[PDB]
């Protein structure tokens, strides 16, 4: 179908504000989110560490995860949208950590081919929450990997910018344990950046 890709920051912000205002998030869900934005790295890291099982989480964190998960019952995208985010070589695997790049800073031809062989045309499960943005912001650009997520209308996705620690701008959050199909993997004109286009399939966490 058709996918709305924002190009004007004011339009994006207005749109986001329009949805956020409708969520009707409790104080606890907002707080749970602010907390996520203050330590997304630790939380998502711990979720990956345990492939998603949370029964080993202290009460405080396990309480927050539950709020986070369920808050998505209030956050759905009203239309098809494109979300963006950047990643480092470790994203593709530990064996890419110090292999992806060339000495001149461009993606390595062979490394890229192995990346495609490993991911192209395959579903991928992300254990952590997925933070993204409504637009291709500067928070990226200097990152080896860029991903364009195609989120269909009705999908769980919430504009959380009003309550985040400006982690970039136009903060958009996706539920944890989501699967997505990587439809395309190409290089930029720069030759120093991998562009990954994917279709968001959804999460396995659907409480309530």
């Amino acid at each position: 179908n058709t996918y709305q890709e924002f190009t004007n920051i004011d339009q994006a912000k207005a749109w986001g504000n329009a949805q956020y205002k409708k969520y009707g998030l409790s104080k606890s869900e907002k707080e749970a989110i602010v907390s996520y934005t203050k330590s997304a790295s630790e939380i998502n890291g711990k979720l990956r560490q345990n492939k998603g099982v949370i029964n080993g989480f202290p009460s405080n964190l396990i309480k927050q995860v539950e709020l986070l998960d369920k808050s998505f019952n209030k956050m759905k995208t009203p239309e098809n949208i494109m979300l963006f985010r950047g990643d480092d070589p470790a994203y593709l695997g530990t064996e890419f950590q110090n292999t992806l790049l060339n000495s001149n800073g461009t993606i390595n031809k062979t490394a890229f081919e192995k990346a495609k062989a490993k991911f192209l045309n395959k579903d991928r499960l992300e254990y952590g929450y997925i933070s993204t943005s409504l637009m291709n912001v500067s928070q990226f650009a200097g990152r080896p990997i860029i991903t364009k997520f195609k989120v269909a209308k009705g999908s769980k996705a919430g504009y959380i910018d009003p309550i985040s620690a400006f982690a970039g701008q136009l903060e958009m959050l996706l539920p944890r344990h989501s699967t997505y199909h990587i439809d395309d993997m190409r290089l930029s004109s720069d030759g120093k950046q991998i562009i990954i286009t994917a279709t968001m399939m959804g999460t396995a966490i659907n409480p309530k």
């Binding site: 907002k30 602010v34 203050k38 009003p162 309550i163 985040s164 620690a165 400006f166």
Partner: protein, 173 residues
């Protein structure tokens, strides 16, 4: 012939104006620093490749009357309006500093930063991120939460305020 960015620290008493200045200056968390003690500091820092000098006026405020306050508000180029996330009163007060600062400088767009300090005291938070972030949007300025204790975002507020001052100096000349 080096750039000098004059920063002024404002905010209610006990919000962390001194701790923030000292944490930035000598990388230490100085607790319960003399409340009525004021001091200006000036160190050299490299801002985006270029070397400049920053001047920080850590105001006491208890007895800075109209003439004293007006002079340094008028002389200061950038302002860090600091408050404590665990004290609703200090947050409400930020509107007063903003107001007075815009009155003497006769300008609605002076380099300014809304800083919610003590982000390490999350358990005692009285001011929500949403509320503070909303006010910042109304004033058309950025909101940043810092912790003079953990040093979180301390460099950021001072360097970001400079970047705003350095840009305002470009518009002019």
């Amino acid at each position: 012939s080096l750039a000098l960015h004059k920063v002024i620290m404002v905010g209610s008493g006990g919000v962390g104006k001194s701790a923030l200045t000292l944490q930035f200056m000598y990388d230490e968390f100085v607790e319960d620093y003399e409340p009525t003690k004021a001091d200006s500091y000036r160190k050299k820092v490299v801002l985006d490749g270029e070397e400049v000098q920053i001047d920080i006026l850590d105001t006491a405020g208890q007895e800075d009357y109209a003439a004293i306050r007006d002079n340094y508000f008028r002389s200061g180029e950038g302002f860090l309006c600091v408050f404590s996330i665990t004290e609703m009163e200090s947050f409400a007060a930020t509107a007063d500093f903003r107001e007075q600062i815009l009155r003497v400088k006769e300008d609605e767009n002076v380099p300014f930063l809304l800083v919610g300090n003590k982000s390490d005291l999350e358990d005692k938070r009285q001011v929500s991120v949403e509320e503070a972030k909303n006010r910042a949007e109304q004033w058309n300025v950025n909101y940043v939460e810092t912790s003079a204790k953990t040093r979180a975002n301390v460099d950021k507020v001072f360097f970001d305020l400079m970047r705003e001052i350095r840009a305002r100096k470009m518009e002019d000349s």
